[PDB]
Amino acid sequence: GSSGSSGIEKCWTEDEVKRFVKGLRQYGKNFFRIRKELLPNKETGELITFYYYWKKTSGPSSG
C-alpha cells in the first residue's frame, strides 16, 4: 500500500562546511553571530545539530 523511494539527497554543501569550521575555529561558541555572517540564510537548527553530530558525544571506542 504505502511505498516509498530514496535517491540523491542533500543536507550540507562543501562551502557551508568550510565556512562553518572556519567560524567555529575563528570565533568559537557563537553560532548566533557566526551564522549571521556565514550562513544567514540557513537556520540555526542546522548548525546546532551539525555541530552536535560533528562533535560525536560518543567518541572513539574499542576495536
UniProtKB/Swiss-Prot annotation:
Residues 8-57 form the SANT domain. Transmembrane segments: none annotated. It is found in: Nucleus. Widely expressed. Expressed in tumor cell lines. It comes from the Eukaryota. Plays a role as a transcriptional repressor during development. May play a role in the control of cell survival. Overexpression of RERE recruits BAX to the nucleus particularly to POD and triggers caspase-3 activation, leading to cell death. Interacts with HDAC1. Interacts with ATN1. Interaction with ATN1 is improved when the poly-Gln region of ATN1 is extended. Interacts with FAT1. The interaction with ATN1 is mediated by the coiled coil domain. It is linked to A chromosomal aberration involving RERE is found in the neuroblastoma cell line NGP. Translocation t(1;15)(p36.2;q24). This is Arginine-glutamic acid dipeptide repeats protein. The lineage of its organism: Eukaryota, Metazoa, Chordata, Craniata, Vertebrata. The gene is RERE.
